[PDB]
Paper text:
Crystals for the NOX-D20:mC5a and NOX-D20:mC5a-desArg complexes both displayed a P21212 symmetry and diffracted to a maximal resolution of 1.8 and 2.0 Å, respectively. The resulting model was then used to solve the NOX-D20:mC5a-desArg structure by molecular replacement (MR). Unexpectedly, the asymmetric units of both NOX-D20:mC5a and NOX-D20:mC5a-desArg crystals contained three molecules of mC5a and only two molecules of NOX-D20. The final models encompass residues Asn679 to Pro750 for mC5a, Asn679 to Lys744 for mC5a-desArg and all 40 nucleotides for the Spiegelmer. The two structures are equivalent, with an r.m.s.d. on all atoms of 0.25 Å between the two complexes, in agreement with the fact that NOX-D20 binds both anaphylatoxins equally well. mC5a adopts the canonical four-helix bundle conformation which superimposes well with the structure of isolated mC5a (PDB 4P3A23) with an r.m.s.d. on C-alpha atoms of 0.43 Å. The NOX-D20:mC5a and NOX-D20:mC5a-desArg structures reveal for the first time the active conformation adopted by an L-nucleic acid aptamer, in particular of a mixed L-RNA/L-DNA aptamer, in complex with its physiological target.
Numbering used by the authors: 679 to 746
Amino acid sequence: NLHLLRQKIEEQAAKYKHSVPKKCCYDGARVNFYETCEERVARVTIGPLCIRAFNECCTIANKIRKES
Ligand SMILES: [Ca+2]
Ligand SMILES: [Ca+2]
C-alpha cells in the first residue's frame, strides 16, 4: 500500500527537524531487498540521529509492506 506508506513515512520524517536526518529516514524507508533493516543500517555512519531515523523509518515501511 504505497499511499499509506507515503503518509506514515511523512509523519515520522516530520519529527526530524533537519534535512539530513530527514533523508536518513526517507532512505531507510526504501529498504526492501534481501537485507533487513538491522543489516542495512549497520553501514550508516553519519551519526546517532541519522541511524535512529533510518531505523525507525525502515521499520515503519517494513511493517506496512508486511500488512499489505
Ligand atoms: Ca531537500
Ligand atoms: Ca542512501
